[PDB]
Design brief:
The structure is a homodimer. Chain A has eleven helices and no strands. By secondary structure, the first copy, chain A, is mainly alpha-helical. At the A-B interface, helix 7, helix 9, helix 10 and helix 11 of A face helix 9, helix 10 and helix 11 of B. The complex binds chloride ion (CL). The PDB classes it as transcription regulator.
Chain lengths: 182, 178
């Protein structure tokens, strides 16, 4: 089964030179398969692209959630994921997803991707249940904390500022302030 | 206006295809000119691109700081900017900026956002804000406006008014001392 190999080649090419650039021929060349092999797995370029988006979302979700267990205290689960996000900066996953349609597909993709972040939801739900977090939708809590520090990571990896360990922990703490009740 | 036409065409191609779809041939064709005319008005693609970046940055800076008066209270300026950012989402201009360097370019760009720096410097000097770097303070607050606004413009998630007000307060919590 060459599906992952093809997705890996595809993702590399998209990271490199984007969605619209993708050639089925170079894909086959880079994946090391005949063109015909690609069509045994994907009906056409457009279906391949959707599978790429879903596959990138799945990898991000497992990277973000790596090392988390729901036994940890809330703040430690938060810190772990926050730091996993920081360490994704400069990766292919970030590169690809910073681009990502109609809205039959657009909403399909969005909905399928949300299901993949089950431990992020459990953190925010548990926090709200415990009276620790502000009572906002998990999408808002995510936007105020995790999703925003993608921005810090991005701007750090691109050189806009250097952050020492004291400074990083200060950033983690400040973002926690955004989501906790005061 | 011919120069400006080329610049607008450049920005449009970039909005559609990024810097990787910006070839001089494609631009000539998008602007309805010969490629020579491009070389005449900019010297080369690098210089065309620096002008695109500066143009786009100035327009973003203008939008971000619209209606901000330096004498108003700290939190009022904050709110105005947070909402200005929110309303950039889904725009033409945000598209082109998303897709877009020298030290001189960055120095010139930063000067355009001087009000944003004065907000953070004044709040730190007054003991209101956490003593962090302005880029970090901005990362902790206004980038929440960007993330939320994006998801919102895409039609992914809808924030009613009370929720938007709460989100503005929450992101203020990130940057103030407690
Ligand atoms: Cl096969």
């Amino acid at each position: 089964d060459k599906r992952d190999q093809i997705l890996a080649a595809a993702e590399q090419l998209i990271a490199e030179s984007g969605f619209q650039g993708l050639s089925m021929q170079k894909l086959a060349n880079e994946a090391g398969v005949a063109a015909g092999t690609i069509y045994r797995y994907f009906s056409d370029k457009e279906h391949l692209l959707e599978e790429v988006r879903l596959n990138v979302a799945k990898r991000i979700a497992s990277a973000v959630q790596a090392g988390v267990n729901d036994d940890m205290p809330l703040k430690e689960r938060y810190r772990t994921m926050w730091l996993n996000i920081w360490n994704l900066a400069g990766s292919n996953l970030n590169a690809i997803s910073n681009r990502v349609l109609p809205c039959t597909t657009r909403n399909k993709t969005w909905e399928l991707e949300r299901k993949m972040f089950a431990q992020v939801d459990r953190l925010f739900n548990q926090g709200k249940e415990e009276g620790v977090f502000k009572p906002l939708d998990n999408e808002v809590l995510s936007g105020l904390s995790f999703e925003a520090s993608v921005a810090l990571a991005r701007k750090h990896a691109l050189g806009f500022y250097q952050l020492d360990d004291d400074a990083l922990e200060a950033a983690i703490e400040a973002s926690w302030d955004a989501i906790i009740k005061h």
